[PDB]
C-alpha cells in the first residue's frame, strides 16, 4: 500500500525556516514526482513545488520559488520541503502528495504537517468546569493554550453521544481558547461522574477535569 | 497566469437534490481534476481527465467541462457528500488549485437549546472571568447572541464559535464567551444571554445572578 508519513507539527517564530519530511513506502520512490501542497486553516489548497527523486530536479510555483527548497533522499525514500523567512501567514498544514497510478491527479497524500508561525510561545491550557444546573448541559473551558490543536474526550471515550467540542478561537492575547460541552439527562447529576480529558500534544500536556454541580 | 475561480464558495443542498459546482478559468484549458476534502483530512482525488471518476466514486457524481468552464455535478445528494470540493489544473510548468466550494446539508428549521454557564470559582481566583452561553443543535447556522450585564448591552468583549454541521442530525451548535476581569465581573449582578434565531418565534433569554 502506498504510504506517505510526514514529520510532526512545528512551532516557529517569524524569520525562521522550517524543514518538513515525508517518508514514502509501498512503491518505488524514484519513479514518481513528490509534490508539496499547503492549506491554511479553512483556506484553499496551494501547490508549492515538486522534486523528481531520480535526478533531484525540482519545479516550484512562482510564488514559492524564492523561499522554498524541495529535495529528496533516495537512500531513505524521504522527501523534504524547506520554507525560509517564515511569517504568520505561512501558518498552514503542509502535505506531500503523489499522483495516481494511472493518471496525473494527486491520489495519495500524507497526513499533513501543521506549522504554526507566531511570536507566541508554546503553552498548555487551563481547564475550567462548566457545571450543570429533562436534559442538562455541562462542559469544560479549555483556555489560553498555544499552538493548536487540542482534543477533548469525556469519561475516557465512554461518552461520545451529545458531545460538541467547539472550534478554537484566537484571542487578542494570541492564545487559543475553546469549550467542549455535552448534554446529559438531568437525573444523572450527582450519580454519574463526568470528566473531560483534554490533550494538548504540542505542550505534551494531558488534563483530566471533573465537572460537578 | 491561469487562475481557477470556483463558484459558489458555499452551498446548502437538501438530500436527493442536484448541485452543480463551477470552476471557471481565464483561458481555455483542458484536463481538469477534482478533489473531495472533509474536515481534518487530506483531499481525495475525485475526477480526472475532466470526466473520469476516481475509483470508488459513486456514479451520481459527474465531471464535465469545455473551454473556460468546468463543472462537477452531484445528481442525488447524500449526507456523506457534504465536503469542500476543489478543482485542479496543470499549466506549464506548475499546478494550480481552485478556491474550493463547501457543500452542506439543508434540513428543516430547528430552534437552539440555550444554556448559560457562570465562571468557575477556580478561574475567578486567577483574576479572569469567562461567561459562556451555549446554543445547541439548531438549523440554520445564522443566529444572534446578545450579552447584557445588569441590562447594559455588551459590545466587543465576547467571541463566538460554530461547530461544523453534525453528521447525524445536520444541526449546528454555537458558543458565545463573554470575558471580563474579576474586578469588572464583581461590579455587576445580572448576566443575561439573549438569542434570536429563525426557529424561535421570539427571542429567548438565559440569565443568572452572580452568586
Amino acid at each position: 500500500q502506498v504510504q506517505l508519513v510526514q514529520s510532526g507539527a512545528e512551532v516557529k517564530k517569524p524569520g525562521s525556516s522550517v524543514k518538513v519530511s515525508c517518508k514514502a513506502s509501498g512503491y518505488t520512490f524514484t519513479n514518481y514526482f513528490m509534490n508539496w501542497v499547503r492549506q491554511a486553516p479553512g483556506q484553499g489548497l496551494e501547490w508549492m513545488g515538486r522534486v523528481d527523486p531520480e535526478q533531484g530536479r525540482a519545479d516550484y510555483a512562482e510564488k514559492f520559488k524564492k523561499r522554498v527548497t524541495i529535495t529528496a533522499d533516495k537512500s531513505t525514500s524521504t522527501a523534504y520541503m524547506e520554507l525560509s523567512s517564515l511569517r504568520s501567514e505561512d501558518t498552514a498544514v503542509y502535505y506531500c502528495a503523489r499522483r495516481a497510478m494511472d493518471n496525473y491527479g494527486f491520489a495519495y497524500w500524507g497526513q499533513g504537517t501543521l506549522v504554526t508561525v507566531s511570536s507566541a510561545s508554546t503553552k498548555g491550557p487551563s481547564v475550567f468546569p462548566l457545571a450543570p444546573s429533562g436534559t442538562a448541559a455541562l462542559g469544560c473551558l479549555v483556555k489560553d493554550y498555544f499552538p493548536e490543536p487540542v482534543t477533548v474526550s469525556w469519561n475516557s471515550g465512554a461518552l461520545t453521544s451529545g458531545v460538541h467540542t467547539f472550534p478554537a478561537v484566537l484571542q487578542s492575547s494570541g492564545l487559543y481558547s475553546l469549550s467542549s460541552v455535552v448534554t446529559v439527562p438531568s437525573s444523572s447529576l450527582g450519580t454519574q461522574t463526568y470528566i473531560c480529558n483534554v490533550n494538548h500534544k504540542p505542550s505534551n500536556t494531558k488534563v483530566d477535569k471533573k465537572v460537578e454541580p | 497566469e491561469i487562475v481557477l475561480t470556483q463558484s459558489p464558495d458555499f452551498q446548502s443542498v437538501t438530500p436527493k437534490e442536484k448541485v452543480t459546482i463551477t470552476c471557471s478559468a481565464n483561458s481555455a484549458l483542458s484536463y481538469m481534476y477534482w478533489y473531495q476534502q472533509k474536515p481534518d483530512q487530506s483531499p481525495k482525488l475525485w475526477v480526472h481527465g475532466t470526466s473520469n471518476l476516481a475509483s470508488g466514486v459513486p456514479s451520481r457524481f459527474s465531471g464535465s467541462g469545455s473551454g473556460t468552464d468546468f463543472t462537477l455535478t452531484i445528481n442525488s445528494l447524500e449526507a456523506e457528500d457534504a465536503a469542500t470540493y476543489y478543482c485542479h489544473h496543470w499549466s506549464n510548468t506548475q499546478w494550480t488549485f481552485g478556491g474550493g466550494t463547501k457543500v452542506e446539508i439543508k434540513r428543516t428549521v430547528a430552534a437552539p437549546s440555550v444554556f448559560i454557564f457562570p465562571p468557575s470559582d477556580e478561574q475567578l481566583k486567577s483574576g479572569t472571568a469567562s461567561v459562556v452561553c451555549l446554543l445547541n443543535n439548531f438549523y440554520p447556522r445564522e443566529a444572534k447572541v446578545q450579552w447584557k450585564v445588569d441590562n447594559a448591552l455588551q459590545s466587543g468583549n465576547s467571541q463566538e464559535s460554530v461547530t461544523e454541521q453534525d453528521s447525524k442530525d445536520s444541526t449546528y451548535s454555537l458558543s458565545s464567551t463573554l470575558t471580563l476581569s474579576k474586578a469588572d465581573y464583581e461590579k455587576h449582578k445580572v448576566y443575561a444571554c439573549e438569542v434570536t434565531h429563525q426557529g424561535l418565534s421570539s427571542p429567548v433569554t438565559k440569565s443568572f445572578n452572580r452568586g
Binding site: 519513479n31 514518481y32 514526482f33 523528481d52 499522483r99 493518471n103 496525473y104 | 484536463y31 496543470w90 499546478w95
Partner: peptide, 9 residues
C-alpha cells in the same frame, strides 16, 4: 509535464 512515467507526455 504534470508527471513522469506516463505516455501522455
Amino acid at each position: 509535464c504534470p508527471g513522469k512515467g506516463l505516455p501522455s507526455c
